[PDB]
Amino acid sequence: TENFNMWKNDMVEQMHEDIISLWDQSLKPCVKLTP
Amino acid sequence: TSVITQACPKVSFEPIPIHYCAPAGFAILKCNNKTFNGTGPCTNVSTVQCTHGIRPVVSTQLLLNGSLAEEEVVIRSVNFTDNAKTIIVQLNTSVEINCTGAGHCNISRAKWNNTLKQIASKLREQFGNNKTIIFKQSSGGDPEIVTHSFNCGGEFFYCNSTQLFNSTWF
Amino acid sequence: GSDTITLPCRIKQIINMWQKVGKAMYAPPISGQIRCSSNITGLLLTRDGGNSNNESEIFRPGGGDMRDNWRSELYKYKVVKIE
């Protein structure tokens, strides 16, 4: 017990990448990104 | 400047509650403090196999279909001092926002004005003993930022919210 | 009596992406009864500055970093290395 937590993560970066990869497989558009 | 022409299809996007369990040789530690407020040494805490039923809803300025506070309205920010940093607000009671493709979203006037004075009872000053709290609307920027954008029934809504954030309290 | 806050809304097809810095275009609607009923569970704000600690504090709606959307649900969690 008596542990530490914060405004960092757990799955924030993980989830974000799961959801970004979830949207892609689902809501397909006609994309345009700038390199 | 990569352009991609996919067979843009009319599908229906639906949210599946996603459970996040322990990743490999790691363990998830849920803080049980009913009113845990961001950063800090959580007293009451315990190991769990998976978090909880998290509904991944993508949307702006209004978190929807998610977890409420079981006690009081709890706000959270990395630094309540740096005005540049987002302040998240966890509500006491849910509010409803009914919308249709016909261009509108209606939410109860009484239900929402109440949550406003609740959120007002603790803004930046930090649950400040007292001062004037003002709710104005977006200064500017992208449409997705300036309006409550979200994906309703597969479609992308851009709801003008000047009426939700334009009031004064103390 | 039954005063409801009516918010003007618009369905756009060309959008700025939230995933990465991009733009995307989707087909127009096919349904004539797009209907959603969501429960506001929170709010993501921001505060006006240049008035630190003074009598008033302006707060405007925010959002954009979808991470800040996951953060509201995952705040009470943390991954610790186990043997």
Swiss-Prot record, chain A:
It is found in: Virion membrane; Host cell membrane; Host endosome membrane. The chain holds residues 90 to 124 of 856 of the full protein. This is Surface protein gp120. The mature envelope protein (Env) consists of a homotrimer of non-covalently associated gp120-gp41 heterodimers. The resulting complex protrudes from the virus surface as a spike. There seems to be as few as 10 spikes on the average virion. Interacts with host CD4, CCR5 and CXCR4. Gp120 also interacts with the C-type lectins CD209/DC-SIGN and CLEC4M/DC-SIGNR (collectively referred to as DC-SIGN(R)). Gp120 and gp41 interact with GalCer. Attaches the virus to the host lymphoid cell by binding to the primary receptor CD4. This interaction induces a structural rearrangement creating a high affinity binding site for a chemokine coreceptor like CXCR4 and/or CCR5. Acts as a ligand for CD209/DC-SIGN and CLEC4M/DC-SIGNR, which are respectively found on dendritic cells (DCs), and on endothelial cells of liver sinusoids and lymph node sinuses. These interactions allow capture of viral particles at mucosal surfaces by these cells and subsequent transmission to permissive cells. It comes from Human immunodeficiency virus type 1 group M subtype B (isolate HXB2). It is a peripheral membrane protein; Single-pass type I membrane protein. It comes from the Viruses.
